[PDB]
Amino acid sequence: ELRVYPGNYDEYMTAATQARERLLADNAKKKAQIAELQSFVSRFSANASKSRQATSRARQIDKIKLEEVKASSRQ
Amino acid sequence: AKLHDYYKDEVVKKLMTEFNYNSVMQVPRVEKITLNMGVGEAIADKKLLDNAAADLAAISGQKPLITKARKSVAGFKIRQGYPIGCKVTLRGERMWEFFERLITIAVPRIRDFRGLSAKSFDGRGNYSMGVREQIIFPEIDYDKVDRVRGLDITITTTAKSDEEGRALLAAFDFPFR
């Protein structure tokens, strides 16, 4: 898509860098916390009496919905 | 066709006398020639098939039909529809012309010639042969081509048996042993 920023060229470069790297860091952080909150869900979602315990946090792993990244046209 | 006239004027009477035939149409007669070559290497380069087609179009005055693979096989990694071979069918006048211009000039030109094998019939009167060098034909002048790609000649005849086919081809002074 076409995204609009103010500036001349250097403001555009700085905004693009500090937005794209911000996105590529935030998405990594969210994916890491998904892989961590998945711990008990894939650890013990079964057996014994605990059973129901891990269902509490099975919904906060899909109330995140990792934002997809798009490969840059620049290559 | 000089060879056609030679056939109908000498070979018919010779073969009836030699074989004790009842009908003039019982005599074995050559009905078609087939020139083919399956290039094989056309998997990674299609232009080589076109070069082969040009070679056969030069060798025989026709346009080769490009034949594709009948079924897929993983031995040579081919699929169905892949163009693999080229083939030319000759009947009648052009067939006689190719027969003459093979057996009178092209056969001597092959390097280290001794004589075509006589045990190379398919038990039903037909004949087959490989040339191993496309440059023995005068239509190819050793400068246009890039390979030593060979041809298969297949003489399909009306002959009932391989013995009758041998006799018919020897009537044309075929270079046997």
Partner: protein
Amino acid sequence: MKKDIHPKYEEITASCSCGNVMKIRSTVGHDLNLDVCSKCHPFFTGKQRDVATGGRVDRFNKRFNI
């Protein structure tokens, strides 16, 4: 035929190295003069001269000048 999808086809006059002039309709565009035809091919004369390679026992007796 199929209306100019094939190469040209015109009569030519080719000759051997001893003459033996023949008319063969081919696709060359110019006649050629070549080696011996089937008539003059030495596959029925030099057969003995073809299978003749060998000989050293006699090549030593000529050396033996004593």
